[PDB]
């Protein structure tokens, strides 16, 4: 029986763009581990993006996750863009560079080493941990101590 891991994630600059953080939650056996950090200046989109990234990076073993996140943006890239962007060497339709790819690549990545079941969830309405992390990310990215050199 495989280790079973939630993981919720939430990211946000306070001011897009500007100074961002991001928040994660990893819940197992009912033990709770947060996971937050800051950037002098980002994006939300990366945010959003590094949040699940560290959430997956964390886990040190092959594990079964359900990946909570009300990212538009997340879901939209696991679901449609991803497998197309690959196709063409990350590059978009209309020749176009894949934008924040070093992420997307390090999200793909990641993915790969878990078996993951996606939950798109509408909003932090219904769903406290994603609002918890909301919180973590907004206390990190008002006192940034990393740098987005992806950004």
């Known amino acids: 029986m495989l280790k079973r891991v939630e ?9 897009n763009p ?4 991001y928040g994660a939650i990893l819940r197992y056996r009912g033990r709770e581990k947060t996971f937050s950090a800051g950037y002098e200046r980002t994006t ?3 945010m959003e993006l590094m949040a699940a990234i560290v959430a997956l990076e964390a886990l040190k073993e092959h594990c079964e996750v359900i990946l909570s996140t009300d990212s538009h943006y997340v ?4 679901t ?3 497998h ?14 894949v934008k924040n790819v070093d992420l997307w690549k390090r999200l793909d990545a990641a993915l790969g080493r878990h078996k993951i079941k996606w939950e798109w969830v509408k909003g932090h309405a219904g769903h406290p ?9 907004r206390a990190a990215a008002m006192k940034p101590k990393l740098e987005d050199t992806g950004y």
Do not use: Q, V
């Not at 500007?18 to 953080?21: A, R, S, T």
């Not at 879901?75 to 696991?78: E, F, L, P, S, T």
């Open 18 to 21: 500007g100074p961002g953080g």
């Open 84 to 97: 197309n962007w690959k196709k063409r060497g990350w590059k978009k339709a209309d020749k176009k560079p």
């Open 80 to 82: 449609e863009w991803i």
């Open 129 to 137: 941990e994603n609002e918890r992390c909301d919180e973590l990310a």
């Open 7 to 15: 993981i919720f994630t939430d990211g946000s600059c306070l001011g």
């Open 75 to 78: 879901r939209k890239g696991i």
């Open 44 to 46: 939300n989109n990366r």
